[PDB]
């Protein structure tokens, strides 16, 4: 029996590593009664439709791919919101009360939410350091494709664009775009470090991907397999924090081998200044999600 697991990312990514672990674990628990076919990006239309349609059972879904159906995921693109420290942040994402707050929004899009997975700190690149909001003024800056994510950088005085990834390398190179944001492994993979001079680490937000399932397939499962599914996802939460820290560190060393790229970690004072200036994205987020958005912000604040 076969479970089909689609990824938004290619081989080598955090999603792929996670999925490999999910495969090995589920096959060993199930005694071969369940086999898992992993479909990385390229090997195949939209993953969220395939999951709703039942064409695949399981998929990763990031806030960008969900923003028009599940706007609450915008929470994950808000700067300085989720706890910085890894353990509180892990606790939150794992909290049944936090997951459950999202479940209805996902159901509303015909999806079963199973959990959240970290892909790493978002990292900024440009051809100058980004130490104060003032450094963003007038900059065309490429953001996640979420209204909330756009507003975050608009708050610093940037002009946010959502240029298609395949075009970003050459637009960066030509100066059509001044910088972008992504986790370090994605930057290395796309080669943006070749056409940028400064990597700024503000630790403002993390890449958080959703694991979702077909709504009826999930519900039409033996309480045993649903435990194999749910307990494994639960286990892999902790290992995911470790996989991404390591993959991102490796990719950062690879980036530095290229040369011509400077690394800047913002001081607490500099971060505090961006926090102050980030607040308006929270307002736009609330306008878009109402009372549910408010409570999510409340749960993640304390
Ligand atoms: Na450079």
From TrEMBL:
It comes from Marinobacter nauticus (strain ATCC 700491 / DSM 11845 / VT8). InterPro entries: DctP_fam, TRAP_DctP_sf. It holds the Pfam family DctP. Keywords: Signal, Transport. GO terms for biological process: transmembrane transport. The keyword RNA-binding does not apply. Belongs to the bacterial solute-binding protein 7 family. This is TRAP dicarboxylate transporter-DctP subunit. Gene3D superfamilies: Bacterial extracellular solute-binding protein, family 7.
């Amino acid at each position: 029996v076969t479970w089909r697991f689609a990824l938004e990312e290619i081989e080598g990514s955090v999603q792929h590593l996670y999925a490999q672990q999910f495969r090995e674990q589920v096959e060993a628990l199930s005694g071969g009664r369940i086999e898992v076919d992993v479909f990385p990006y390229g090997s195949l239309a939209q993953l969220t439709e395939l999951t709703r349609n039942g064409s695949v059972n399981l998929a990763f879904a990031s806030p960008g791919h969900l923003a028009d159906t599940v706007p609450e995921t915008g929470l994950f693109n808000l700067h300085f919101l989720l706890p910085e420290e890894q353990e509180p942040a892990r606790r939150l994402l794992e909290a049944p009360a936090f997951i459950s707050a999202f479940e209805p929004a996902y159901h509303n899009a015909g999806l079963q939410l199973l959990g959240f997975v970290p892909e790493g700190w978002m990292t900024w690149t440009a051809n100058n350091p980004l130490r104060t909001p003032s450094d963003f003024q007038g900059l065309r800056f490429r953001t996640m494709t979420s209204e909330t994510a756009a507003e975050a950088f608009r708050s610093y005085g940037a002009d946010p664009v959502q240029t298609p990834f395949a075009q970003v390398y050459s637009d960066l190179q030509l100066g059509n775009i001044d910088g972008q944001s992504n986790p370090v492994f994605a930057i290395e993979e796309m080669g943006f470090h070749e056409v940028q001079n400064v990597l700024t680490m503000a630790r403002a937000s993390r890449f958080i991907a959703s694991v979702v399932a077909n709504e009826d397939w999930f519900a039409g499962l033996p309480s045993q397999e649903r435990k194999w599914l749910e307990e494994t996802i639960a286990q892999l939460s902790e290992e995911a924090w470790t996989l991404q820290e390591d993959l991102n560190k490796e990719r950062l060393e690879t980036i530095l081998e290229q040369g011509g790229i400077r690394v800047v970690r913002l001081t607490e004072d500099e971060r505090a200044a961006f926090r102050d200036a980030s607040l308006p994205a929270r307002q736009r987020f609330i306008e878009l999600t109402g009372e549910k958005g408010q409570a999510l912000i409340q749960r993640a604040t304390s």
